[PDB]
Amino acid sequence: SSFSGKYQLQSQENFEAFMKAIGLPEELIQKGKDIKGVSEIVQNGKHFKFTITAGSKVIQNEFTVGEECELETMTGEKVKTVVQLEGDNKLVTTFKNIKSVTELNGDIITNTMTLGDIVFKRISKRIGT
Ligand SMILES: CCCCCCCCCCCCCCCC(=O)O
Ligand SMILES: CCCCCCCCCCCCCCCC(=O)O
């Protein structure tokens, strides 16, 4: 259960440019750019559930490491992909040409999404249990 916990965004880089590019409606990005979203992760071996909450926006996802999964993304688009572990603390996947890396270091989770030259980075911090 390496990843299990509740974390809240501390800061992020390139939100507006990234979200605009991927098709997030401008009302959503203006509403969301300064929201400190909360991510809740439950890991049980290879099985993950996660919930991302940003204001009124609640996205729930699940996947099994190394298997095909269906992820609901920022816009609502559901994509078929595979999420892999690279060691106990790093989740890596790709969808819509975006590379997503989620890495836990103690209580800090860093998520990096790369689309072409755009690197959207989020840093979150554990908040309680
Ligand atoms: C009126 C409230 C609505 C606010 C709209 C929120 C728009 C932001 C949507 C993107 C949130 C998900 C991004 C995090 C994904 C990740 O890095 O793992
Ligand atoms: C909008 C969801 C996109 C899916 C992103 C990759 C899925 C595998 C990693 C899921 C762990 C969730 C960690 C979120 C970290 C954060 O909120 O910045």
From Swiss-Prot:
SUPFAM superfamilies: Lipocalins (SSF50814). One of its GO terms (cellular component) is extracellular exosome. One of its GO terms (molecular function) is fatty acid binding. It is found in: Cytoplasm. InterPro entries: Calycin (IPR012674), Fatty_acid-bd (IPR000463), ILBP (IPR031259). Plays a role in lipoprotein-mediated cholesterol uptake in hepatocytes. Binds cholesterol. Binds free fatty acids and their coenzyme A derivatives, bilirubin, and some other small molecules in the cytoplasm. May be involved in intracellular lipid transport. Forms a beta-barrel structure that accommodates hydrophobic ligands in its interior. Belongs to the calycin superfamily. Fatty-acid binding protein (FABP) family. This is Fatty acid-binding protein, liver. The lineage of its organism: Eukaryota, Metazoa, Chordata, Craniata, Vertebrata.
